[PDB]
Amino acid sequence: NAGPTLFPGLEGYRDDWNFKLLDRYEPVITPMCDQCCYCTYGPCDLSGNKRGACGIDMKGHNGREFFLRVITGTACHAAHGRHLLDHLIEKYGEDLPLTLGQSNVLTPNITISTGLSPKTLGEVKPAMEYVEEQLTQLLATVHAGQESAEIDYDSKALFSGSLDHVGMEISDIVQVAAYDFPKADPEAPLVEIGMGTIDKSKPFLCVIGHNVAGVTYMMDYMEDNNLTDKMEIAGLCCTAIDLTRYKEADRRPPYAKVIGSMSKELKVIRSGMPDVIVVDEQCVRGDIVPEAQKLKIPVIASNPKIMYGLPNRTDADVDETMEELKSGKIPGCVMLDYDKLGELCVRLTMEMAPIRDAAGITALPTDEELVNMVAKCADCGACLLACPEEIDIPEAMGFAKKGDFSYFEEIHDTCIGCRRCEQVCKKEIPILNVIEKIAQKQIAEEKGLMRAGRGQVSDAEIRAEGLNLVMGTTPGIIAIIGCPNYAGGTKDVYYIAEEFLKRNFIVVTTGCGAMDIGMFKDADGKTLYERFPGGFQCGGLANIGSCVSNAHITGAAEKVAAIFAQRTLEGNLAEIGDYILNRVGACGLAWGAFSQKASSIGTGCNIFGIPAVLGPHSSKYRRALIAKTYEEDKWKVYDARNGQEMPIPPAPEFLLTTAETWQEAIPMMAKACIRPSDNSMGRAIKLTHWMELHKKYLGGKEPEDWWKFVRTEADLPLATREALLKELEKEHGWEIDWKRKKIISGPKIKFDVSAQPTNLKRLCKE
Amino acid sequence: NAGPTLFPGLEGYRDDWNFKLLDRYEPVITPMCDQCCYCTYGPCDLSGNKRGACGIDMKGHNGREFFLRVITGTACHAAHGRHLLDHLIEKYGEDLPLTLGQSNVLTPNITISTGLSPKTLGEVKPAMEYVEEQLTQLLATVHAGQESAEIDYDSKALFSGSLDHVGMEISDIVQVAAYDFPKADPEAPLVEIGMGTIDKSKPFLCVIGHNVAGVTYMMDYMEDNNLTDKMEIAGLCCTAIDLTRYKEADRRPPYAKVIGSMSKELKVIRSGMPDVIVVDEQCVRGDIVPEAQKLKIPVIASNPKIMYGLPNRTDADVDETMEELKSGKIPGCVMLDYDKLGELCVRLTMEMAPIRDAAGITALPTDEELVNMVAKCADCGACLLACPEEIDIPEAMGFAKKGDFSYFEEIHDTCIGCRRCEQVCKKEIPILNVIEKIAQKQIAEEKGLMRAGRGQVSDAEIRAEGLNLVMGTTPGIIAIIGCPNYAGGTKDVYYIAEEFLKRNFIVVTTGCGAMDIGMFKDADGKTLYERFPGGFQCGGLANIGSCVSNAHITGAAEKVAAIFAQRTLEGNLAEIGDYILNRVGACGLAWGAFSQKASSIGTGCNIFGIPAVLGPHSSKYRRALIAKTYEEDKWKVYDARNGQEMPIPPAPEFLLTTAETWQEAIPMMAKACIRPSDNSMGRAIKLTHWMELHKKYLGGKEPEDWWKFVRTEADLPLATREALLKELEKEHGWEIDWKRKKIISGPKIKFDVSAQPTNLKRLCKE
Amino acid sequence: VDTTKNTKLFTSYGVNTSKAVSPEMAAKIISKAKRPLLMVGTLALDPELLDRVVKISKAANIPIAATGSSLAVLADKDVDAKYINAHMLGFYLTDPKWPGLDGNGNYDMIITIGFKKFYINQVLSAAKNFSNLKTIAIERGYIQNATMSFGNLSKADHYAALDELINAL
Amino acid sequence: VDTTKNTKLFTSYGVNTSKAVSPEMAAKIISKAKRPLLMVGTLALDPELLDRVVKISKAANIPIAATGSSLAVLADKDVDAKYINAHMLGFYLTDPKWPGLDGNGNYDMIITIGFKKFYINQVLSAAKNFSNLKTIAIERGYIQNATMSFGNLSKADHYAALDELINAL
Ligand code: SF4
Ligand code: SF4
Numbered sequence A, B: 001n002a003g004p005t006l007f008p009g010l011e012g013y014r015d016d017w018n019f020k021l022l023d024r025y026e027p028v029i030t031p032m033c034d035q036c037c038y039c040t041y042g043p044c045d046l047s048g049n050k051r052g053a054c055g056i057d058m059k060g061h062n063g064r065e066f067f068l069r070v071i072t073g074t075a076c077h078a079a080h081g082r083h084l085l086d087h088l089i090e091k092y093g094e095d096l097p098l099t100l101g102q103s104n105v106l107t108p109n110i111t112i113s114t115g116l117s118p119k120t121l122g123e124v125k126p127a128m129e130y131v132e133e134q135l136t137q138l139l140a141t142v143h144a145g146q147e148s149a150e151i152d153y154d155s156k157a158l159f160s161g162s163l164d165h166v167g168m169e170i171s172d173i174v175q176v177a178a179y180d181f182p183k184a185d186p187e188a189p190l191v192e193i194g195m196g197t198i199d200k201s202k203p204f205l206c207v208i209g210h211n212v213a214g215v216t217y218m219m220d221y222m223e224d225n226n227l228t229d230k231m232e233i234a235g236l237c238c239t240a241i242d243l244t245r246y247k248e249a250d251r252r253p254p255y256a257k258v259i260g261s262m263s264k265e266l267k268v269i270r271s272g273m274p275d276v277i278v279v280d281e282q283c284v285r286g287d288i289v290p291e292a293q294k295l296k297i298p299v300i301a302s303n304p305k306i307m308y309g310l311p312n313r314t315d316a317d318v319d320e321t322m323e324e325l326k327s328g329k330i331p332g333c334v335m336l337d338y339d340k341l342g343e344l345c346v347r348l349t350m351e352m353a354p355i356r357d358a359a360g361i362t363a364l365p366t367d368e369e370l371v372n373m374v375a376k377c378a379d380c381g382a383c384l385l386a387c388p389e390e391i392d393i394p395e396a397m398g399f400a401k402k403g404d405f406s407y408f409e410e411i412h413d414t415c416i417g418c419r420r421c422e423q424v425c426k427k428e429i430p431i432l433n434v435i436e437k438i439a440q441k442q443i444a445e446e447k448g449l450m451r452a453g454r455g456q457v458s459d460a461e462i463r464a465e466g467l468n469l470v471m472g473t474t475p476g477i478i479a480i481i482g483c484p485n486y487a488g489g490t491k492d493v494y495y496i497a498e499e500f501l502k503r504n505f506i507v508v509t510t511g512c513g514a515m516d517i518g519m520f521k522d523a524d525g526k527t528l529y530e531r532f533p534g535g536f537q538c539g540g541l542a543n544i545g546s547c548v549s550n551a552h553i554t555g556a557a558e559k560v561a562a563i564f565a566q567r568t569l570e571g572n573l574a575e576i577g578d579y580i581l582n583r584v585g586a587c588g589l590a591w592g593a594f595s596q597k598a599s600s601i602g603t604g605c606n607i608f609g610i611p612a613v614l615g616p617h618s619s620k621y622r623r624a625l626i627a628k629t630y631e632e633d634k635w636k637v638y639d640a641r642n643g644q645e646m647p648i649p650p651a652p653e654f655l656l657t658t659a660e661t662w663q664e665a666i667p668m669m670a671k672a673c674i675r676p677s678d679n680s681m682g683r684a685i686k687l688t689h690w691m692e693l694h695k696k697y698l699g700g701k702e703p704e705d706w707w708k709f710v711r712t713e714a715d716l717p718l719a720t721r722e723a724l725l726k727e728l729e730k731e732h733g734w735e736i737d738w739k740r741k742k743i744i745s746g747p748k749i750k751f752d753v754s755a756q757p758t759n760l761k762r763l764c765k766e
Numbered sequence C, D: 001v002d003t004t005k006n007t008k009l010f011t012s013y014g015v016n017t018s019k020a021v022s023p024e025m026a027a028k029i030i031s032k033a034k035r036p037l038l039m040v041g042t043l044a045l046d047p048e049l050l051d052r053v054v055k056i057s058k059a060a061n062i063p064i065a066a067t068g069s070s071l072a073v074l075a076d077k078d079v080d081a082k083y084i085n086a087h088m089l090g091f092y093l094t095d096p097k098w099p100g101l102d103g104n105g106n107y108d109m110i111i112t113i114g115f116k117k118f119y120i121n122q123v124l125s126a127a128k129n130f131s132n133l134k135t136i137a138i139e140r141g142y143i144q145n146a147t148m149s150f151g152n153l154s155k156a157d158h159y160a161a162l163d164e165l166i167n168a169l
């Protein structure tokens, strides 16, 4: 019954699938550095594809470096999962059932890799152990003198990507079950988001991190003490999404808020609004303590992965530790006991509010201070050179010197609040505070709504959308996910989500992307979550959840194959990815990808035949997967009906690439959804959206290669079918029958309703 | 009964022990690069201890980078262990007993971390799972936005080091048991070693790697087919040591040979002697395939961690795959099936020998070719700039142009055979082949003996040496281990081992160090293994085994505390390391450390209170642990008898440092063995060796600080006690009683036979 | 304008870096090319640079590879521009057998302009290490991974330098 | 001898590198130091360099920190040399409160010679990033992590340059 790969090892998918994917979507290596500094024989200059002292060449090393980022991302989601699993089993028992909503195929990723269909917390243990076991084998391959072939590091990376989604799945399903998160809910409640949503008069407990476990005790303590309306509790990064999913299965009104993405961490701290900061792990700034300290904000480290060299008070009495923190004797402490954490953070917050108000703190510079520091600028250009976004700060200073703050006001949203610029300013100008002071107006308006993390896509939704997706009449699944390291501001994901929602694609989002998507409103003052329904449906926008919830996106695609197509999941990744690559239109977008976790997630999507567009900074990961559209033999598959080779259109033309601007990204994503098995109506529809979006965002003319995706007159966009038939005859020489208006000759690929395109020979009838 | 740390997490040893170790032996950060290229916000210029865009400072990042090397090394030994454990359990059953020799404390490292005392293969599973679980948590901390404090990355690194020795222990005990390796054998057989020991007329199967599992099938096939005397089977790196430990528990004559360290890999290939090469994993060159191919040497990849992008033939028939390889159609293949591997490698070897001989191959350039290529040298200096050892090749070429090959002949032993120089030579001179051609004479003389991997130190030996080691009368344990990235040739470890063996220290060695130590002979033509007995005894030299056997070195020190001192091991690492740091004289030496594995091993020794001297290239790891000898308050501990603070001498003065030359290393190592609890005779003895070695290798004068280790006249070296008492009075002003010749005043530290020095307050009686 | 005095970098890819050229040197290098390509970005492209990109294309008759969404503004201009993703282009340029944008083969000189420095340095890292393709960056910033490049320039000096280059084509 | 024309490196630690100085510039920098230290290595120290190390110490009256096993050969020479491990020294030099080798405090100018380039560059990486200590390398190789350094030199030119420096002290 099961596929050929149960609990596979590193080589499991190598020859059967990965190498096939890698032959078409070729690794494009762009070194981030020309050297390797892994061991003492080095560093080695690998410029020009030279080999290191150990023998590995530049391409091999960069494959190795990308592989390292992937497994580091894989380990993050896994470590997260292991901690939730152990804690949750210890608190609620091994027999606690996995209640994730209306679905019978509960853990697709887990089932695919292990053949197991866990129904309880304890039943998930074997999958978690498998992942941890594989990660050790994978980290060992990063050691000098291990793999040297770029292509084999890529196969190892793709494999790790499949593991990442297993670990992410484990992470989210156990917390969805134990913490009563929404259950595949199309009507998950709208949560308020943005630095402007905070009630400055109330004490403010700010949490930054990923593991929501400790925060649940904070919230339980607040509810027990009737503090939910007296103080504010809001988070940054994933913990913000998960904490606002807590006990929301019944759709009760959210009482907590969400500040924003990782980009808001230094910005919210500099604002001085937080009274207490509690950090957990992952995507947590490394300068939080000294920054918090400037504004008398105590810092509590609640996870061993980040202790900041702070004194440990895990076994100390709460009252005394609170006195040490409120008095400012210590800037913060480590508190690893959850029972003590809840009370400590909430109480310290209530008590810190008055203390900090009495301190007479002026977080940002006064009007006078601003004018003075701006006048100090020497136009030396250092800040611009050090800015990761290459923002022209010297120009903004120049204009601000003469009362034109429009430049600084526009900079605010593009700036990622990293303060590299401040460290290089010889006049010691706190550049970030200059931007934030000038942006006060805009910040007060930073108020949006984000629909809570909904969880999985239900089997019911898969049955409703399965056929449509496969024929192509539903143009595809658009997944907007990932980090906020955008190159042009945070409104990009909004415009993109909107364009696609209006054209009726299925849009799902997670993490920082889900957050920013809800930070803007239209002329009527409505958010996209308000304008479009939250179901997994055409024209629907669903915030799947935190970054670990990305596992439900590949999970949904996997369920299309398992439920609609009735393919076997158990130990059968290759068949499932192959099915998706050939018949399920979809495209991911990680417009501001920055983290190692983003590389693993994207790589996981890739091994399942799902392409992804990343923002320009992503070019720094070192390895893209792009196909040569001009090489005929790169576009042939088998027809499972007979084993004969058959040609396929060049779609998608990549699996992992970068786009420069959001305007470019849109048409690229639309085109990326075209699939070999689209039926005639589906293709016509996909070609309509793509050709239209290409004209709208790239100059007004049609895509030069639009004709490469036409098998018959029925594939042609209906409204302009006439003019198009003309172009095919006119600029391509195709023979047309103007009586019935159809194509006689020209297409190199024929339409065949019964064809079974596959990259796997073993699935063919020979 | 058990200590406070069973199955500890990352923070387990942080406050109780690691931070105490780190306060005295301070992290010394020497960046290998001034930037960080971990994520897309970067790269970040961290020069001047600036902070990256994420907030982490330079020291934090370098702590993070060292930590990454450590966990990568930890994962290598662990992945190795997991593969042996699964395979061995599958082949011999879970109930197979761990037969490791005459010992009752079978797995010290495992017991310390887990409280478990496994007696069978299956009983080791829980420890292996623990390690894999922790490695996932550790790799996740390498992710951007996790830990930012250098000191906390160091604590996390020390913890990982303890894990590394757990994984190494697991690796070696399961193979010692299942493969009948020597059982703590002082008379393990001498094995021939060196490229000169090979019988060129016989077919030669060359194996490079670490996991011996597949090689055992090769050897089983040879024995079954009466080929042990017809062909040669020899290895490079650890697999060479383990394959020559195979079924040696009964001391049968070795029929296999050992080529050498990782430095011999390209050298042996260039010699053309190998007929077939089989690689496994770790420390395997990345250019083996193209180099082997030049001389028609088929390559077989037998481990998924290194597949070189080669075609997979795991499921193909042996006969046909052999035809593909002998015909040269494919340069090599992947063969992951052990049952097929044994037959395939051995048979291909027997069959390749004649084929390659008939080919008429001339591996190295002829006399004429050598003279010609040498005359081509332009003295452009490129090779010298690119040489990791900064060898003056242009000078050697200059002299060789006029018939003086003494320079090239001396270069041979210092050269690590990495060929970086060849890649930068514009005249395309195969510099490495020039050195090897000229070194033919010397290579033919490269014949030594290495005593086989003996395994653990038995309880009997611990009882025999325990007291002596603790009083100091046995000057200390000297561990010569690690890689061959030496800065001045491979004879250094020999001279060092000898100096110490003659002064009656207990010398143990492993890995590449064990190999080179046996590559030289004295005026009588005898090796150190022949001149000194193989027991764990004063004046004894024992080759513990391959790199995973290093676990028995910390294991022996741990058993001194468990058996001699009767301290509890279960979940009690801190007490054990503290005991060792205060009372067990020892010092490791990894003179040519290069690998990530070496950093983890050394870090593991460190957390157990064992200092280690590394070669100069090791400065590239980025973090050393050195104490300030001039700061009084860095040298105080508690007296467990009363809880009062007490001063201790500055010994050891570091935990992890580099030495530049072997002459400097010797006295440093001797001094490093001095311990606070030495009794009077012990101290006198340690001071004798150190002061004498310092005079012998560093100028003839006494160590300026020798007087800092004198508590009473009885601590003074007996032969020169007179003159010394003079110096103390003369150059220090101490009051002497010349009648009985003793010290009246001067020592800042008193002798107290009942004192209980400890860095752990919790162990004191308050 | 002196376009070679400032070659500061925040971070480095290593020991290999572009040679800083003057406006006249760049003009001569470009005129000598047999089959040049003008690779245009969008994120650092402003109206002033757009005008100059058009004049360079015309003055030297160089086809334009409109990357990102630059074709959005180049479309209503009298130039030979065709859309192509920068990452894809950076890859294709390393393939000797690529038919190119007009089907007549690859190019012998790539001229980059209008890109953020981090993005073009990455795309260019491929050609730099895996091809012998010559590239010339004419941005207001010093580009390490080009064969040659202008040094860091004030916006005004950039506009001036490009005008000097145009006057020399 | 021209000791500033060749500053080639195989690999780089980054954008920050030492300023190449001439033999006369090095002489002036060293004479101006109030409390200089001559940090001597062993692996690249030959008999010819040993003789020059002695003359520099004497001509400028600079105490010597004999690292590695250099004291082995400096011991029978008429100089003020004291043994200290290089790694330890590199660490201590970054501590303002270090009493130094004679107990009279730290130094204001470190002169390095006789080291392999990779080792001294590493030891020096600490002072470079975590101190404002000035260092001057006078090896036959260009040292990136020193404040200033000679460029790459042939052995003969090195010997000549050191003689010119000595004649200028
Ligand atoms: S791993 Fe290889 S390429 Fe990297 S520093 Fe070591 S020898 Fe050089
Ligand atoms: S804080 Fe903003 S302006 Fe400053 S370097 Fe970071 S992104 Fe650029």
Ligand code: SF4
Residues within 6 Å of the ligand: A376, A377, A378, A379, A380, A381, A382, A383, A384, A393, A394, A397, A424, A425, A426, A427, A428, A429, A431
């Ligand atoms: S670094 Fe400071 S002084 Fe220089 S241009 Fe920027 S804000 Fe002005």
Ligand code: SF4
Residues within 6 Å of the ligand: B036, B037, B038, B039, B040, B041, B042, B043, B044, B051, B052, B053, B054, B055, B056, B061, B144, B145
């Ligand atoms: S991890 Fe931090 S220091 Fe490193 S590249 Fe990313 S932002 Fe820069």
Ligand code: SF4
Residues within 6 Å of the ligand: B386, B387, B388, B389, B390, B391, B393, B414, B415, B416, B417, B418, B419, B420, B421, B422, B431, B432
């Ligand atoms: S092969 Fe030998 S001479 Fe050449 S770079 Fe390597 S160590 Fe130096």
Ligand code: SF4
Residues within 6 Å of the ligand: B376, B377, B378, B379, B380, B381, B382, B383, B384, B393, B394, B397, B424, B425, B426, B427, B428, B429, B431
């Ligand atoms: S790189 Fe070649 S030509 Fe130049 S000095 Fe070395 S051996 Fe001679």
Ligand SMILES: [Fe+3]
Residues within 6 Å of the ligand: A210, A237, A238, A283, A511, A546, A547
């Ligand atoms: Fe996240």
Ligand SMILES: [Fe+3]
Residues within 6 Å of the ligand: B210, B237, B238, B283, B511, B546, B547
């Ligand atoms: Fe080894």
